[PDB]
Design a protein around this ligand. Sequence first.
Ligand SMILES: CC1(C)[C@@H](OC(=O)CCC(=O)O)CC[C@]2(C)[C@H]3C(=O)C=C4[C@@H]5C[C@@](C)(C(=O)O)CC[C@]5(C)CC[C@@]4(C)[C@]3(C)CC[C@@H]12
Lengths: 309, 312, 315, 315, 313, 309
Amino acid sequence: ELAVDKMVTCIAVGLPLLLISLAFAQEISIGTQISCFSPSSFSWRQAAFVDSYCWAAVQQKNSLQSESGNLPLWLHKFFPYILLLFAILLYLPPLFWRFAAAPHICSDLKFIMEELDKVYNRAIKAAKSARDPIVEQYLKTKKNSNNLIIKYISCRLLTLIIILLACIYLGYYFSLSSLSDEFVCSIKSGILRNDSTVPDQFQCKLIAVGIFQLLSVINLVVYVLLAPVVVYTLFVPFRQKTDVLKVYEILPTFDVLHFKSEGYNDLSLYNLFLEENISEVKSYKCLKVLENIKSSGQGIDPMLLLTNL
Amino acid sequence: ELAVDKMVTCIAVGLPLLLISLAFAQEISIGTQISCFSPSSFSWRQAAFVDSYCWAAVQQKNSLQSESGNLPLWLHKFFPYILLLFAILLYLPPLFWRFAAAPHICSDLKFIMEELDKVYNRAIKAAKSARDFKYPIVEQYLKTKKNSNNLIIKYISCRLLTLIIILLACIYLGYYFSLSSLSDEFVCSIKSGILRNDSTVPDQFQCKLIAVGIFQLLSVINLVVYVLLAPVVVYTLFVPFRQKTDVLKVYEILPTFDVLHFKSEGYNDLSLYNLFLEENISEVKSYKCLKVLENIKSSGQGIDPMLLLTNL
Amino acid sequence: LRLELAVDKMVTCIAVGLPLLLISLAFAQEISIGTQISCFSPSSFSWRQAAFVDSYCWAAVQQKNSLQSESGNLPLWLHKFFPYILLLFAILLYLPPLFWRFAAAPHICSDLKFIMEELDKVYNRAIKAAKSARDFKYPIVEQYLKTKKNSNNLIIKYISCRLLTLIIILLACIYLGYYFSLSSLSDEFVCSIKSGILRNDSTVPDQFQCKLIAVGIFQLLSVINLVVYVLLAPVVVYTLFVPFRQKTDVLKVYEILPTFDVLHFKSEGYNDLSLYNLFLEENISEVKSYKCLKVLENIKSSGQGIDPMLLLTNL
Amino acid sequence: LRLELAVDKMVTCIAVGLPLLLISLAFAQEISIGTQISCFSPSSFSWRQAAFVDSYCWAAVQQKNSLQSESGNLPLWLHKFFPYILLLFAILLYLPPLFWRFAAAPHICSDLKFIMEELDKVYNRAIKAAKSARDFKYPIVEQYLKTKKNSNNLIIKYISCRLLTLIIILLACIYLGYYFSLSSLSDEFVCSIKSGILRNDSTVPDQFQCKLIAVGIFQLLSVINLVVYVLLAPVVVYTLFVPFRQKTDVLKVYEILPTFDVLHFKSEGYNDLSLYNLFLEENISEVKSYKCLKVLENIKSSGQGIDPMLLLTNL
Amino acid sequence: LELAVDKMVTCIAVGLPLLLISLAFAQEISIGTQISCFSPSSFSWRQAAFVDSYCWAAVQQKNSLQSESGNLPLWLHKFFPYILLLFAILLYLPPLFWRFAAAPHICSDLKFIMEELDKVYNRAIKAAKSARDFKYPIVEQYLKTKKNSNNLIIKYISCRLLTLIIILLACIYLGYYFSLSSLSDEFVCSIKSGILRNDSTVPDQFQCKLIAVGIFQLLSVINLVVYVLLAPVVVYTLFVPFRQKTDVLKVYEILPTFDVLHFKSEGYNDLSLYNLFLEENISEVKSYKCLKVLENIKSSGQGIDPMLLLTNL
Amino acid sequence: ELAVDKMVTCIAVGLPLLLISLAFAQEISIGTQISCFSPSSFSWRQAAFVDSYCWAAVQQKNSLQSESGNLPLWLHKFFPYILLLFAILLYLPPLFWRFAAAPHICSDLKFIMEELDKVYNRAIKAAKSARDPIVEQYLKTKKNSNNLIIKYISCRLLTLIIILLACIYLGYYFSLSSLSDEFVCSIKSGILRNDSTVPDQFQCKLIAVGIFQLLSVINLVVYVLLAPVVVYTLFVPFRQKTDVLKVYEILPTFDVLHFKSEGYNDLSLYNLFLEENISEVKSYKCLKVLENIKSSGQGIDPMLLLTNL
Ligand SMILES: CC1(C)[C@@H](OC(=O)CCC(=O)O)CC[C@]2(C)[C@H]3C(=O)C=C4[C@@H]5C[C@@](C)(C(=O)O)CC[C@]5(C)CC[C@@]4(C)[C@]3(C)CC[C@@H]12
């Protein structure tokens, strides 16, 4: 998993979870999520009934009358589970990737690294004997099929789509007349309908809403900062730079051909993954040492290769 | 476990669990699950008795009178347990197939990969000796694999039970999801036993099952995800349709390997083995090199045995 | 392969764990009294009516129309969101290290392990040549050293994570200094539950005297965090100027080997070579050849014997 | 490779775990009665009004205008911040051992392992020369130790961490002696909830008698911490006197080897040589050659045979 | 590195006060608060809570509370839990020697003795094998030296003596708690300092009772019983010489390459401590095992010493 | 630790702990351990005082008057800890066994297994060359000293004694009337003595005592089922059988002598531990393959041994 992809996943998933836990934590909360102000004559349990009834009655549109509407009321209860839903949906593409995409790119990349080590060993053995292109074709093939890279850009595109949907939802959540939690509630269905001791309507207010909006704007800011990162990561061809196989062109047992650029094809994705995992390849490390020395141009490539051993 | 099967299991199991855990958020729950509105004269403990009695009385059909019926009350009080039951039943087929079916296919697949590497080595050794037995054992093994569907029958059986349980969960959630939205309100009467002819206690109490609305909003989410998941299982259910890009066709260019794919068209274990080979074949080095030669053959510049000898 | 300089590890540990420890302290059971707000409803108000007043005013520190405070609504916002701010700073300060932990490591750890292996190899070859005398030759790692200064991209990542750490630490210092500068009377605000149907109600009084509790603890902890952070910022800066911290040339001890060219060539640049010099100075104690060579170099201070002979004796 | 002297490890363990253990005891499920403050509102006050009075006065130990105490506002501040002061001392006392282990530890180990290897090698060479008689020559370790004497920087990190430990222990002793030197009546303060709209209110009494509970436990634990710390301070001071502790010259047993020069040359300095002498005296029992040489040296007390003969017999 | 009897004495003397602390405050035995004061009926809930907490904090202020037994019994109950942990810590401190790196002081020398014994056994059987086809008693001289310095054994008997002293002090303290009547929890309390002094609605004095003190005494007697059972074990363990019998070396005397001398007994010196540690760790020594096999066979006398040695091979 | 000893320890220790944890289950426990029923005129805090006073007054014999006596009251409150005390005392002998005796038998058993593998290797090497008793004396010695086995039977005997004492205590406690949890308590010492608003006596009842008795009978049943197991384990000689070294008698390099039976000596204990840990010995496994075969007569012992390789 590319470092930028790992960090995008970590942010887009842990941020909604951390924000839920912020508001979610009991210490942060003052108490219940709703308070309704029953009359003074009401007993403790009658007031508890009013609170719980109105909490359950934000759904039943007939009971509650709110200036903003019933949708803002339903939105508040939705948000604790809505952020977790966004976290899960944002975790899904990385899960699909590791489960399916890595297995295909992992085998190919391990084979390419083994073949590169083998060609390096054979080149130095030929050079050592003097002192005394399967991988290229595979990569040429990799250019023909974009399907392996299509899994990657598809998981990235779903990540971007879900991030944009979360940004859209967060923006609607961020701007709220906050008067919705102040919407009235009437416990007058059933036998309580014509009852007289119970007042006609109660002034309820949704607890911990302001915290939800302050956290939703934070999530929206982080997500609109993250979306350009995904879009840049979405474009695989642009990120393919510092041609990694160019360092291998100084080997006799290796054909003089990079042939890795310019396409929305799996070859560019493999170039990125090679640029990432190539530091594990010892032969690449030694070849890059020789290539950097070649900047001065003092000695010669085959001599330093043989001498380096 | 195939990636699509692993993700279907992860969804179908974790979604009901995640939804259970959400339905009881330390911020979505206002408090108790039921509230009954005792009279003002009732003390705190008398009101607590009314609440707890009616909570326990959603079962006793004689005590409570509800317009929708007692079945909605049962469903509103046993909403969690049912989701956990669905999660467990959906986890059972992945547990079953993994425990017994997996190793059977693992041994066979490892043997097939070893035999393919061996035939590749022998073919290049024969070619190398030319530059300087012969029994298709794996082909015969795969020909046999076609005869018995039993290994694949375990797979399609676990997938079919997964689909059946997913459809039953969809039915329950659609039924439960499509509620009256007044059922959560039931009239309850604490008048059995010595309280029957008591006078200070009113005839009936107006109870409401709080946080039911959350149950329905989560049940519709579960139903949507499950009716999105069911086509995936049905597609995964059909093993023959999934298989393509004949993997052994790349081996047909070897002299030590008979020219025969012979892997298609059946509800038999051969198609399942074809899928698992298509998945795990990238680990096979000989397959990788042979596919390199096969892709080069698209241009048709050189020749298969020459490039193979040059492959070393 | 720690892949984190000790000073960087301790700066991360402090800058991250201190806000977390302070959050956990601000709500220790002995420290807190109960709710975060108390509003003093009238005596006629029932228990639940007083609970409504408390919760309403807690939620009403946001709605500017309801509450009237002498200091303003901004202190009220800052007092309610005390805990949230502390965690965010911890995460942002832990964010740079996470990037360094995953993105930065492949570029450096691999290079440093290769350099250590090459140094051990050149030491072995030098003593083998000396042993054969008692009875190729390409400076590959030195050629490697030139590349370090050449490409500053590897160094760029390090100074960038350090610079973001410094920027976030300075922003945290600014916020904590502002928060600690709060009035300490601004936690008392007048709140009025008179919106909606309660507006023209008469039994409810016009306004309630609410006080935000656990704010003095927040300020006392914010000043502690600010002190520790303004002590930490020079360490990060000190850290930012790597060219200055690259000292005690580590490869100079290897110059006494015949199989090693006589050239340090590691100094004076905002390039990856200085960063590699720091990481070599840190992780070089694991290199056995470096340890023995430093033993010989320290002995050479007296100048009694000779470098190649001493090496032969060590074998 | 412990890199922590047993006396230093125990001083750290005590000075750090004792304030933590005492914090954990001060709030045992059996020592806290409940809230940290109780204010005795009038009987007419409701439950929530009394809770408001308690929380207000708790937050009002800071606002000097509200509360009137005979001892002053400083005792009130010190009583409210009681547990924070101990965790801070625990952390500050843990800091020097952390600085020691993080950087100083690795440097000390390599040198000691090299010295032990060189001593085993010189012993082997001496017995091989003696064995050949029964049938180079450079004092490298002696020169290395002679060098160790030249640089006091190595013996300065250690005495600096010990000196900071002693300074923090003395500051903790001063604070705990002051805190225990409490009036024990200063936990009772008069508090008045009469700011804001409550100022001219009449139903609320003029002042409340609040008491800061669980203070007596704090003082009883502070005196325990002070006693243990004033018992620990002489231990740190003795640890500080590093040359005085360098005794029973460990290399003196090696002077009976022909392949080893007849020179101890390890004493009398605030230099890294004395620290290395201590660490050698500690870790030298692992050295087999030292064990056998000490066997011969103890036998030499009787003086029956001879040193080289005995060595040959041991083989 | 810690004798089994010492390990069990430490385990008991440390875990028993901790287990008893944890039991004293179990939910099943604690009814609730540790003090209850019985305010008048007119007092509100919070006023009664104030009375309880005030008297809890007032067991220290001697002016406020009047108790028949005195203020010391009152102070004892509050500090009783702390004492239980203080005694556990002080009893863990001497074992701290084992916790600290003092192993080399004894074990490193032991490891050398075991290696030297294996070497002398190998050399003896090699000489016997060559017969079938130097010579310096270095370990014997080392043990002879070990006799000269008692200092290593002085660390051991010092940690054991501090363990015994702390155990006896704990027995004395716990004995006292059991002895006390404990009506102490029934001592009166008066919340009449400050502005409450001349107040009239508050009664003159409250009858407070200290909760969980009977549990404290019942657990203190258990701790005292276990500790007075443990003290003889420490005293016996204190006497290292009386703790040594059937020395391991007496089996090596049948080797030609080993001098015929045990020379290990009768002293308050490090040699006796090394004898104990050798008797413990000697079963790991293979040469000792085979030599003890031959020595046990020699009880019958059927097989020759050197012959059986060579025969075993 | 022998499997039967490990299971006896596990039961005898975890059962009182599990029962303690059950006796105080959230569903199981209703609340406080005592309730006293103060008059209705008493305030909340006065009733709390009565409860706590009587809880502390089950000790002071003058205050409370109970029909069964003060001893049942003491046992009521102290029953929960008493189970932990029994668990600890039952854990003590297995703990002593681990340090005091387990290493002594471990070193000897490891040496015996090594010597058996060595004698097997030497026997097959002699047989292989043809195709081309130290351990016995040690065991003979083991017979002479019972001291190692005396540690084992001593820890088992203390386990049995503590189990029997626990059975006695639990049978007594379960034999309580179950009305002894109701005691009359009088808060009339001190200044309350001549007070008039406080009633003369309160009817207190000890909470969770029926649960204690129902759990004590379970513990007693399990313990009287466990005691015969310990008694059988107590008799080491009656347990040893299937002479394990008899399979080694078919080796030329091994003397033809079992010599392991009939004694209250450490040899029988070593026989048990060998019978347990001997399956780890490869030479024993092969000899048992062929040892059994020799009895059958299908093949000769030395030939099959040489063929075993
Ligand atoms: C803590 C809770 C909320 C509750 O606590 C729990 O349910 C357990 C969960 C938890 O504690 O967190 C238990 C009930 C209770 C302890 C409750 C009580 O007992 C009796 C009264 C009285 C009722 C009244 C007005 C009358 O009846 O006339 C007389 C005045 C008085 C004292 C007012 C306050 C309450 C209502 C009082 C003290 C408020 C606190 C309350």
